[PDB]
């Protein structure tokens, strides 16, 4: 009496993930503006994905964040404070043409562990829906892990399939401007 798993068992993910939503209130503290749900199988990922609004359908000023269970989508978290992110800056036209598919590919890269061993350095990704231009970013745990960071950025850019000549940069969180712009630099580029 041994049922065949492939017939009734859900496809497990390497990690359990949590989806977060951010609603700008302008007044409230950034943190006060929430967890949606968590999942750790392929089937559960789609069930959640299929019933939530596409990023392009969200009001400007909102964010979707998918992070490994236990890691809050903020700079202050133990797994992000020494880290950084690969930033994808989209123009206004790309909201229609690339925002949604780019975000889905990002999700597939995360849950599918597409960066091989370097996937352990991945914390999560966030998509910012903004009137001036949408942004997508994959956050990693340590900005000093060049090998991991550069390989992730390379595979990520490849997966998105955007023109190879376009360069993207990685910025550490501890380096974000604290003045009025103070030139927010990149530590790496690919």
């Amino acid at each position: 009496e041994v049922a065949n798993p492939e017939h009734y068992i859900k496809h497990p993910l390497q990690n359990r993930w949590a989806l977060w939503f951010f609603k700008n209130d302008k007044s409230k503290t950034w943190q006060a503006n929430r967890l949606i749900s968590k999942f750790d199988t392929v089937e559960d990922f789609w069930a959640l994905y299929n019933h939530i609004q596409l990023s392009s359908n969200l009001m400007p000023g909102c964010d979707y964040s998918l992070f490994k269970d236990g890691i809050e989508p903020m700079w202050e978290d133990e797994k992000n404070k020494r880290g950084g992110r690969w930033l994808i800056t989209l123009n206004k036209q790309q909201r229609r043409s690339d925002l949604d598919r780019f975000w889905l590919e990002t999700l597939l890269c995360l849950i599918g562990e597409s960066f091989d061993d370097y996937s352990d350095d991945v914390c999560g990704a966030v998509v910012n829906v903004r009137a001036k231009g949408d942004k997508i970013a994959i956050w990693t745990t340590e900005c000093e892990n060049r090998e991991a960071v550069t390989h992730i950025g390379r595979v990520y850019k490849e997966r998105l399939g955007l023109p190879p000549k376009i360069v993207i940069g990685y910025q550490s969180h501890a380096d974000t401007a604290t003045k009025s712009g103070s030139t927010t630099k990149n530590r790496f580029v690919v």
């Binding site: 497990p12 089937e43 599918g112 562990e113 091989d116 061993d117």
Partner: peptide, 19 residues
Amino acid sequence: PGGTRIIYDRKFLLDRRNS
């Protein structure tokens, strides 16, 4: 290094989007 990581290719994941 070392560890049986569960890896899924995009095609595998997309084929089960509706399943």
